[PDB]
């Protein structure tokens, strides 16, 4: 298929300290260059949420855009056993990859970037929890979660876990209990507000408005690398503006198209712009809603 989703808006950087030596071809992310930390997010039948919201940012890109900070340590050390910073949050999570990886990133409870690290030449397991011994050695970070990145200024750091009726979900201990718990690996979403913690989600009710905002489009440089071009500079219909732009019927129906006499190419996107969510009966704008298969200990007896 046409790799039109590789054009990431903003910076588009996917590299972390410690390992991953493929940063020379993935900084930024364009057509040229291969990277195992992003080509696996475009294959169908894996993460449909990221494919539906592929017009925004990722996790590492959100870290490089001054949105998500970096935890300490940013790379978990698997050489020392008997517990290490990055075991309670991963052991309960159920992931899967096509093997041949060394690094893997996910989200922590604080809200920063907590990843692991596999020293050469050690291979991860089939689930990415532990490690093993030794095809090719992909030093890229395998996406463990299915979240995205977006810019927002709505404050909301006074909300904790909204789930009710669950004893201990993930790593957050909401209440104590020593009885029988319905231990089962369920798919529970999560979201992070402006400088908040790992806020679990009991239900997902997204909201996307299709307007003329630059975040709702992916207008790039007209060809006949590619970054994020401001759509506000495009002239209106029956008027005059600054720069020139062109597109198809969805873009030419409201603005002006000059075909080859344009410096940018605008096009309509699917699922992009202001993304809201329902929480405590009040609409709020998070920073990235994802999914994870953590251990959910529901009440029983």
């Amino acid at each position: 298929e046409d790799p039109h989703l590789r054009n990431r808006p903003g910076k588009g950087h996917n590299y972390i300290d410690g390992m991953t030596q493929e940063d020379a071809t993935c900084k930024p992310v364009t057509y040229a260059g291969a990277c195992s930390s992003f080509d696996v997010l475009l294959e169908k039948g894996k993460f449909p949420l990221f494919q539906s919201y592929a017009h925004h940012r990722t996790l590492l890109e959100a870290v490089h855009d001054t949105i998500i900070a970096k935890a300490d340590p940013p790379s978990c050390d698997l050489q020392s056993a008997h517990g290490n910073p990055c075991m309670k949050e991963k052991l309960v999570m159920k992931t899967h990859c096509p093997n041949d990886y060394q690094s893997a990133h996910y989200l922590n409870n604080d809200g920063k970037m907590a990843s692991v690290k596999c020293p050469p030449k050690y291979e991860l397991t089939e689930d990415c929890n532990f490690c093993r011994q030794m095809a090719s050695l992909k030093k890229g970070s395998y996406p463990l979660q299915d979240l995205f990145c977006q810019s927002s200024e709505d404050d909301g750091s006074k909300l904790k876990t909204k789930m009710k009726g669950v004893c201990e979900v993930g790593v957050q201990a909401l209440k104590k209990c020593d009885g029988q718990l319905s231990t089962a690996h369920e798919v529970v979403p999560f979201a992070v507000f402006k400088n908040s913690k790992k806020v679990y989600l009991d239900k997902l009710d997204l909201k996307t408005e299709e307007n003329l905002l630059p975040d709702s489009f992916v207008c790039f440089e007209h060809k006949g690398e590619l970054k994020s071009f401001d759509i506000s500079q495009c002239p209106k219909i029956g008027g005059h503006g600054s720069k020139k732009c062109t597109g198809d019927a969805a873009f030419c129906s409201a603005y002006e198209c000059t075909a080859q006499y344009a410096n940018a190419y605008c096009s309509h996107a699917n699922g992009s712009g202001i993304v809201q969510i329902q929480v405590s009966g009040v609409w709020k704008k998070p920073l990235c809603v994802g999914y994870e298969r953590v251990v959910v200990k529901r009440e029983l007896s």
């Binding site: 449909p48 539906s52 798919v187 239900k203 997902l204 299709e210 999914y291």
Partner: protein, 431 residues
């Protein structure tokens, strides 16, 4: 309490003895007949070998008269709670058509809800259209669409099983004791058969039943008491009826499995452009379970639950008249002639006469070795068997008589020599 009220001798056609290792043993390859005892009474089976002292007995202790129910069409039910999920998209965007959501199938995952996860519950997918324009945040002039993805989950920590009874089977819990002393507690109803170590047994005569049981539904609770509802069995599950959402197993209700049944077009919705509140008016069975909790007073019977074995029963206040068929699957009965002594003494004799209850006898058997004691009368109609050990213990069983002044001479022995014994006691008239 022990005490065989009805005693019969086995026929010689199905009684063949043998000899192996200075011991005379015999097997039974037939079936005898004996009257079923009442509450407290028993029904022994006297077995004879080649002579007089070699005599075995098979005591069957009757608990009480019960009327079990026969379960037919059963199903589990419980409370649930839906969860409405809204996702509005613009028109001409992917699958945001106003004509596709009208005939949208429930078993079709839309493109806006393909990232839910492993949801093996009672899920469905609808499609309600809304408005468009710039007033609700839409780029196209055509009206937008709102995708619906609501799945049912279980919220109650327990459940209930609603069933019925097509007929009241007169079940009799019998505690059959083998010849050697093995105690086995079984049950027999109407004409049902079981499997014992000595062969098989089944109830013969049965003249006790309660008519009109199809118009009564029963509710079983895990561990707690049962229930009864004065209504016929639930037919098709429809809206506004007790039992509109059923399943097949307890796990199908405690986890809300998609293999169960539910009423069509039952989950209501509140189309509010972007908001949605899916609420259902489910029938709470706990109210009926609390209003009609066993035991209750129904006609002249007592409906209650049952211990040990799960099932509904029916306490009656009538007589116990039944027959038992002791089928022996060619089982050998051995016996060793003891040689220990035993000086027994009489204590008291209380009870009644001319009734199915009987009279309790008190005997102070004092022996020096572990064995068995055999007693009999003079004409050959009464037999008393009691264990014996080293020490002084008080034993006895239930005896039947037709005279308030019991003056029958007994002949008990423990090794071979038989000594006389006289008993006495005043009884009362018990019907």
């Amino acid at each position: 309490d022990p005490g065989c009220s009805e005693l019969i001798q086995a026929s010689s056609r199905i009684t063949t003895c043998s000899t192996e290792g200075v011991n005379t043993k015999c097997r039974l390859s037939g079936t005898a007949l004996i009257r079923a005892g009442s509450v407290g009474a028993e029904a022994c089976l006297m077995l004879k070998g080649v002579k007089e002292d070699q005599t075995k007995f098979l005591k069957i202790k009757t608990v009480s008269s019960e009327l079990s129910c026969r379960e037919g069409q059963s199903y589990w039910t419980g409370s649930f709670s839906p969860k409405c999920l809204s996702s509005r998209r613009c028109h001409l965007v992917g699958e945001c058509h106003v004509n596709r959501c009208l005939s949208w199938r429930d078993n079709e995952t839309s493109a806006e809800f393909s990232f839910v996860g492993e949801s093996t519950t009672m899920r469905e997918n609808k499609c309600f259209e809304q408005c468009g324009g710039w007033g609700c945040g839409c780029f196209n002039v055509n009206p937008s669409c709102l995708f619906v993805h609501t799945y049912l989950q279980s919220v109650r920590k327990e459940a209930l099983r609603v069933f019925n009874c097509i007929d009241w089977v007169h079940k009799l819990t019998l505690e059959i004791t083998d010849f050697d002393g093995s105690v086995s507690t079984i049950d027999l109803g109407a004409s049902s058969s079981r499997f014992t170590n000595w062969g098989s047994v089944s109830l013969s005569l049965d003249a006790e039943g309660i008519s009109g049981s199809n118009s009564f539904s029963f509710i079983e609770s895990p561990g707690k008491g049962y229930a009864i509802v004065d209504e016929p069995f639930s037919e098709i599950p429809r809206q506004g009826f007790l039992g509109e959402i059923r399943c097949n197993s307890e796990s199908s209700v405690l986890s809300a499995h998609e293999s169960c049944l539910r009423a069509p077009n039952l989950i209501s919705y509140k189309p509010m452009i972007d908001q949605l509140e899916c609420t259902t008016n489910l029938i709470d069975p706990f109210v009926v379970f609390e209003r009609g909790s066993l035991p209750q007073t129904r006609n002249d019977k007592t409906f209650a639950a049952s211990k040990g074995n799960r099932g509904v029963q029916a306490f009656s206040k009538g007589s116990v008249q039944a027959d038992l068929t002791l089928m022996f699957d060619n089982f050998e009965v051995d016996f060793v002639g003891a040689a220990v002594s035993c000086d027994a003494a009489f204590l008291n004799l209380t009870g009644c006469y001319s009734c199915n209850a009987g009279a309790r006898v008190c005997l102070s058997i004092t022996s020096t070795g572990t064995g068995s004691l055999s007693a009999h009368n003079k004409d050959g109609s009464l037999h008393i068997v009691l264990p014996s050990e080293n020490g002084t213990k008080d034993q006895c069983q239930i005896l039947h008589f037709t005279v308030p002044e019991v003056e029958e001479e007994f002949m008990y022995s423990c090794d071979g020599d038989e000594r006389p014994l006289l008993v006495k006691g005043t009884l009362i008239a018990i019907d």
